[PDB]
Design a protein around this nucleic acid. Structure first.
Lengths: 185, 50, 99, 84, 181, 141, 35
RNA sequence: CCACCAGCCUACCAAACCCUGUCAAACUCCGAAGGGUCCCAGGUGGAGCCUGGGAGUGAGGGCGCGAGCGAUAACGUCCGCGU
RNA sequence: AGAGCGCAAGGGUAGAAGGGGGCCUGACUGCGAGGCCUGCAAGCCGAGCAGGGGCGAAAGCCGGGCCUAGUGAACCGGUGGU
RNA sequence: UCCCCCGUGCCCAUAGCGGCGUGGAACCACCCGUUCCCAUUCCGAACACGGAAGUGAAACGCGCCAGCGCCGAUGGUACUGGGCGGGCGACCGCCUGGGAGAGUAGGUCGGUGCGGGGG
């Protein structure tokens, strides 16, 4: 979806920030210059899409170049946004994370023990034509001390995988009742 | 060091010297091996004294 | 794997790289500096006799003369897996004082 | 004031530290006999017309110029160009 | 080129059966034989001297050749000799005399093992070889009651071109090996 | 309450503390997170007291993850014994905490629950804190 | 099998216990066994 | 719950490996701003160099960042560069 | 290269220092340029040259030891000797 | 002056690892023999030596692929020469010039120099 865009130059980093606009960068196989945009609207847009869905930045050069984000480098101290990277899209093989949707409340759950998941996004290679909005995956009946991983998840056809996939996707573990104070003994 | 002892080597046919060291525990008796004299050429040298 | 830089133990100054196959000797004189080689002879690659040993003798000997024929005194002796059996050229005739 | 116990020690010791390192860098002239590297290991293996001795030391063999060298799969080196 | 039973019958049974069954299209690729090695791990020579090595040569003197003893690595204070100089018997066998071993092996060594339902199959490397041994030592031909002291086992080996299991076992049907299967 | 298990040197030097935090500044784990603002130590005593404080507030809770680890000696000497002589004794095990550092995460609760949990627990911490959700940082191994 | 003190070879038999007339060749010259 | 030996099996704990974060003065794949130093050149200054006589010094203190000690206490202490 | 590398540690190490055997005794004498280090005095580096040797066909290295601890100015006197 | 193999040198892993295919008409390698030189702390495995009808299986030589392993921009933060602040303090900010680490895109199954034997 749409955000503005602004061609960056040889202007000092700090100032662009403490004026009104966060700075950025874009690169695709050969195309590399420097860019930047507003803060507040950018933050709004980001909070939705970010490295989940697709961005479309219409730039003061005449066009409407659509990218994805990629990497959110911050200041860490009083941590908060400060220069991101953008990825100029196409139709070529590309790995990226897909936010997953654990749907349905299992048996390990409701018995007490709660899901201690591993991921909320999986690395997967796809053609940029496939948009796997979010794999609204099962988690029908996970048990306490029970796990699930691998290719267990449904994958939207074409949208391949990119781990092992023995990467354990999630699992349910015990609570932490006041009987853990008896442990203090 | 002492008790493992140290010794000098002496030629034959009278005198010629150097300054070396020994060791007893290994079944060693007459320490005897080559060297060179001040006067003349290559000779044996026998273990001797302090 | 007789690498060991037997090279280095002879990399005093000025080599002479030789090696054998199943049937053919490859006697060559290599100078370093930049890497430039120099002088050749081969038991069964000079179109010569078909008896490894003696040919090699003569071949080295051939090369031997060749050495002095183009201004050679003493150099090294690049040989890997030798077991030192002379190869009674040993380039000992070999001008060089191979042996 | 109460001066009862007090846990002593057995630690404080060091070394009359000799000064070790690259004595002569590059671009430097030597009259042979001048040592260019006092090292403990072989951080600097011999170069051209440079020698080594019992204490791992790159010293001069001629009257020329120290030249530095690196060889990933062989180590680091220090040499002396001739200057004829 | 001294030929006998297992060698000649190596030629005859091996070539056709092997290739025609498994399809080898190369003269020097046929899953042939390689070395055959025998080994004795006695931790009894903690001292014992080479009075007990007389029993070590005894072993290889009935197999034909002059044995070579090796030693050991590091510290086994839990079970004495650590520094590593007691005894480690090894002998390597090439073609001809190796064929002697295999011969006397299949012909008389195996017989008077009373409880002999056949050899242990599963002991295949997978990467393509076989490793075992035995207990009753004097089962070998040129050694009657007199030689041995009490009991003494052994650890043989067989190195082969074999890269799979079945080809190795078939190789042992053409070279004929008494299995339990 | 955490520490190593006898390792290398016992006594080590406390040193001054800058503020790059080196790393550890997002959620990734739980869902709600307590992160700090004052460059100080976290005390094993406190550590336990806060972990409890959370657990305590929400009986039969979820899973409370502890990112930081208290693995530094308190070089403390006795009392009224005059100076010099020896270093001290390893005592009170703690850790370096430089602001903008995740220290504990609550997962699987009410909004209110993790709110007041992190609230009270961190309120018991040797300093003061900020409590954040889980979003703007996503993508970091 | 070179070296020197090598414990030898030579032909052996197997005068077994089934009328068997086996041709063998080993360190000892007169071998006879069972089957 | 069978042996010439097997087989299948847990919100117990756990070798290793893997994923998930991270810790370090005496850990280091990487490793700067600096710093030291060898040649080209500027540089005329109570600069620098060489022999030579007379010295006085060798309780120091403060201030800044840099590390130790201390309790990230002391007009505390003990070093580093700087004043 | 994470083992061994005599014994603490650190650097170093198989393109060997480690590990095997053969041979031997340079664990030489007379020196020693030019250096490291440096308040002095000490300590530490080494080609080279002569002798006369040990190893190797040689090329070659050998004036102990993988490297840094294993040490004691001078005065006193014993010692074999010119 | 060229296309191929071999004895061998240089950069330092964009050369290494691994699946695929491969070439011997010369080179090369296995391989033929263990009696003459030689030797296995035992085996002719290794080095050694006299030698064919085969082979190109391996060893090796060459091509494809990135899968491991290798290098890795750009930006911007870190940290900081040197210059000024602010807070009892733990510490923090402005100036200038320098300028990483981790990661992101991409890239990589070599580069080259010699001397002979072949067409």
């Amino acid at each position: 979806y749409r955000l503005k865009a602004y061609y960056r130059e040889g202007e000092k980093p700090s100032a662009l920030r403490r004026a009104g606009k966060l700075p950025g960068v874009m690169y695709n196989r050969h195309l590399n210059r420097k860019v930047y945009v507003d803060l507040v609207e950018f933050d709004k847009v980001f909070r939705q899409a970010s490295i989940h869905h697709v961005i479309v930045l219409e730039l003061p050069d005449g066009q409407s170049l659509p990218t994805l984000v990629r990497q959110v480098n911050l200041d860490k101290r009083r941590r908060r946004p400060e220069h991101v990277d953008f990825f100029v899209l196409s139709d070529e093989p590309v790995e990226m994370y897909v936010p997953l949707r654990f749907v349905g409340t299992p048996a390990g759950v409701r018995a007490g023990g709660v899901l201690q998941e591993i991921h909320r996004d999986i690395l997967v290679k796809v053609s940029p034509r496939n948009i796997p909005e979010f794999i609204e995956v099962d988690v029908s009946g996970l048990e306490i001390g029970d796990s699930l991983h691998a290719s267990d998840l449904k994958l939207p056809p074409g949208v391949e995988l990119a781990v092992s996939p023995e990467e354990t996707i999630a699992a349910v573990v015990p609570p932490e009742d006041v009987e853990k104070l008896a442990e203090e003994a | 060091v002492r008790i493992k002892l140290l010794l000098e080597c002496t030629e034959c046919k009278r005198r010629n010297y150097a300054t070396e060291k020994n060791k007893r525990n290994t079944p060693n008796k007459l320490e005897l091996r080559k060297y060179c004299p001040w006067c003349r050429k290559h000779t044996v040298h026998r273990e001797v004294k302090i | 794997k007789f690498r060991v830089r037997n090279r280095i133990k002879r990399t005093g100054r000025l080599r002479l790289s030789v090696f054998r196959s199943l049937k053919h000797i490859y006697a060559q004189i290599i100078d370093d500096e930049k890497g430039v080689t120099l002088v050749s002879a081969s038991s069964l690659a000079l179109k010569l006799k078909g008896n490894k040993t003696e040919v090699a003798r003569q071949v080295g000997r051939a090369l031997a003369e060749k050495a002095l024929a183009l201004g050679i005194k003493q150099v090294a002796f690049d040989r890997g897996p030798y077991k030192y059996h002379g190869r009674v050229k040993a380039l000992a005739e070999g001008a060089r004082e191979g042996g | 004031a109460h001066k009862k116990g007090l846990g002593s020690t057995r630690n404080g010791r060091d070394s009359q530290a000799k000064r070790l390192g690259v004595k002569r860098y590059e671009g430097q002239v030597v009259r042979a006999g001048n040592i260019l590297v006092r090292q403990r290991g072989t951080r600097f293996k011999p170069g051209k017309n440079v020698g080594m001795g019992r204490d791992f030391t790159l010293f001069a063999l001629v009257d020329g110029v120290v030249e530095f060298q690196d060889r990933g799969r062989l180590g680091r080196y220090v040499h002396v160009r001739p200057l004829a | 080129p001294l030929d006998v039973a297992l060698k000649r019958k190596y030629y005859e049974e091996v070539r056709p059966e092997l290739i025609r069954r498994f399809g080898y299209q190369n003269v020097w690729e046929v899953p042939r034989l390689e070395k055959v090695v025998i080994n004795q791990g006695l931790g009894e020579a903690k001292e014992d001297a080479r009075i007990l090595e007389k029993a070590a040569q005894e072993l290889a003197l009935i197999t034909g050749q002059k044995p070579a003893v090796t030693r050991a690595k590091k510290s086994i204070s839990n079970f004495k000799l650590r520094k590593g100089m007691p005894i480690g018997l090894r002998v390597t066998l090439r073609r001809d005399r190796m064929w002697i071993f295999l011969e006397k092996l299949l012909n008389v060594a195996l017989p008077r093992i009373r409880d002999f339902r056949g050899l242990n199959p599963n002991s295949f490397d997978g990467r393509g070889n076989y490793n075992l041994g035995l207990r009753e030592q004097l089962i070998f031909p040129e050694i009657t009651y007199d030689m041995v002291d009490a009991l003494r086992g052994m650890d043989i080996a067989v190195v082969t071109t074999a890269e799979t299991d079945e080809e190795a076992r078939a190789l042992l049907e053409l070279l004929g090996f008494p299995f339990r299967k | 309450m955490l520490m190593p298990r006898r390792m290398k040197y016992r006594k080590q030097q406390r040193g001054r503390l800058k503020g790059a935090t080196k790393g550890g500044d997002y959620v990734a784990f739980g869902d709600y997170g307590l992160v700090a603002l004052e460059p100080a130590w976290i005390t094993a005593q406190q550590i336990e007291a806060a972990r409890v404080a959370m657990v305590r507030h929400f009986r039969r809770g979820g899973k409370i993850f502890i990112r930081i680890f208290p693995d530094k000696p308190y070089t403390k000497k006795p009392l009224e014994v005059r100076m010099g002589k020896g270093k001290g004794n390893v005592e009170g095990y703690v850790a370096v905490v430089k602001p903008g550092r995740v220290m504990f995460e609550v997962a699987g609760v009410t909004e209110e629950q993790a709110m007041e949990a992190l609230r009270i627990a961190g309120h018991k911490l040797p300093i003061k804190t900020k409590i954040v959700r889980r979003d703007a940082y996503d993508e970091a191994q | 099998m070179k070296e020197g003190i090598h414990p030898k070879l030579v032909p052996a038999r197997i005068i077994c216990g089934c009328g068997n007339v086996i041709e063998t060749y080993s360190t000892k010259p007169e071998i006879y066994v069972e089957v």
